[PDB]
Amino acid sequence: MELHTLRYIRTAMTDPGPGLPWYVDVGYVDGELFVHYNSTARRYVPRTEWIAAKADQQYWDGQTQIGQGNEQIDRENLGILQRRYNQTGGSHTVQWMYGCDILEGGPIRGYYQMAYDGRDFTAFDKGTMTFTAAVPEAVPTKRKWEEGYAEGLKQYLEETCVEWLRRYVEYGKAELGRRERPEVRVWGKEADGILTLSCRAHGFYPRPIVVSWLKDGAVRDAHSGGIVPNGDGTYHTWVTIDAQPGDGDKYQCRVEHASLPQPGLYSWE
């Protein structure tokens, strides 16, 4: 079954760090970064080859204008929320995430969620067409918005978001569905009478992977770094197991991945 996702995330900061934009908005299709806007560049730009090739000029200019308009509203929001919380200076951050999921071409999720200072602020409930106030300072926002706007947002999440996701999926189909096999190394180092065995998988796509240590052929005291990105749109993971010196040969790393018809099996040599 064919599952695809469109997710936009946005941040407004009083304190991005030296030489960094206070305002950043990026989009992802199936977890792949494909567009980016920020307050320094003041333009939407491609982050994949496929969006770069297949979107027209009106796409880039249209969204740039929306992006510039949003920035101004978002600058104000941060200002408002600080004044509202009676705060002078310091470090404050507004965050938003929204988008839609399709399954066999049909919509299954539509969402819109906001945070202030790392915690939930509001979320849109598409069924009831209301906003939830997860904090008291979200009450004036819930009111201001519900006495339109909610009909507009519902339409965006069920119609606009879904038709564009279908379009993106068609534009990027080859790239989004690609596979790249992991390059795996087993590394052992002995210290304090413990043999630590490492299985490290490099350069896999897509993101999900399962890497297990087997002792005498049974799944095992492991520790995992989880899945972390490389710079090039592939992923990385490592898993360790503690063993007794001399028992190296009873251990075998198993890697299960969409790129591999049969699990990879790797040993310490």
């Binding site: 995330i9 790392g118 915690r119 710079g231």
Partner: protein, 98 residues
């Protein structure tokens, strides 16, 4: 406030004298301001690139830094991280695994 969880790793399994990329990854932190610096023998590595910042479904932020490098067998590589949740820079060492 949440402290960065940091990992250092190379794009490919490393060999002395083969071109590669050194990565330093920080996740699970708030606020978003963070400094992440790749170093060789205590000297910042030239050519580092910073990925667009992202945040996860739990709202916590992540950032990747990466730089092209050809690993030297006789050098130590590390990532130095500064964040508000810690008073001192944190240094994380790369294990070449060669």
């Amino acid at each position: 406030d949440l402290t960065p969880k940091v990992q250092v790793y190379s794009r490919f399994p490393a060999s002395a004298g083969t071109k590669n990329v050194l990565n330093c990854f920080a996740a699970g932190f708030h606020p978003p301001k963070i400094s992440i610096t790749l170093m060789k023998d205590g000297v910042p590595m030239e050519g580092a690139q910073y990925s667009d910042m992202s945040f996860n479904d739990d709202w916590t932020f992540q950032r990747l830094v990466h730089a092209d490098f050809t690993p030297s067998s006789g050098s130590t590589y590390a990532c130095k991280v500064e964040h508000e949740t810690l008073k001192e820079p944190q240094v994380y060492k790369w294990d070449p695994e060669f």
